[PDB]
Every structure is written in structure tokens, then in C-alpha cells.
UniProtKB/Swiss-Prot annotation, chains A, B:
This is Transient receptor potential cation channel subfamily M member 3. Constitutively active, non-selective divalent cation-conducting channel that is permeable to Ca(2+), Mn(2+), and Mg(2+), with a high permeability for Ca(2+). However, can be enhanced by increasing temperature and by ligands, including the endogenous neurosteroid pregnenolone sulfate and sphingosine-1 and suppressed by intracellular Mg(2+). Implicated in a variety of cellular processes, including insulin/peptide secretion, vascular constriction and dilation, noxious heat sensing, inflammatory and spontaneous pain sensitivity. Homotetramer. Interacts with TRPM1; the interaction results in the formation of a heteromultimeric cation channel complex that are functionally different from the homomeric channels. Belongs to the transient receptor (TC 1.A.4) family. LTrpC subfamily. TRPM3 sub-subfamily. It comes from Mus musculus. It is found in: Cell membrane. Disruption phenotype: Trpm3-deficient mice exhibit clear deficits in their avoidance to noxious heat. Trpm3-deficient mice display reduced hypersensitivity to thermal, but not to mechanical, stimuli in carrageen-induced inflammatory pain. In the chronic constriction injury (CCI) model of neuropathic pain, intraperitoneal injection of isosakuranetin or primidone do not reduced heat sensitivity in Trpm3-deficient mice.
Length: 22, 22
């Protein structure tokens, strides 16, 4: 069930991580 | 298959849970 939480919470975290790395 | 069942009905469940808890 926690897989569902990980799925819906990837796009925004990915964008934020990209910005932080940049 | 059952992963997608929880996956397709997640965001509304989370919002309703937040409303009910508050």
C-alpha cells in the first residue's frame, strides 16, 4: 500500500531535487 | 493488479482523511 504513496509523490520531489542539485 | 486498484483511488482518499481528521 505504501507503493501507492511513493507513486503519487515522485513528480514534485523529482523537480525539487533537480532544482536543489542545480 | 491490486497495486493499481489502490493507486487509482489514493488522492481523494488522502484528502477525505485529512478533512475527517481535522
Amino acid at each position: 500500500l505504501l507503493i501507492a504513496v511513493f507513486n503519487n509523490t515522485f513528480f514534485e520531489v523529482k523537480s525539487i531535487s533537480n532544482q536543489v542539485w542545480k
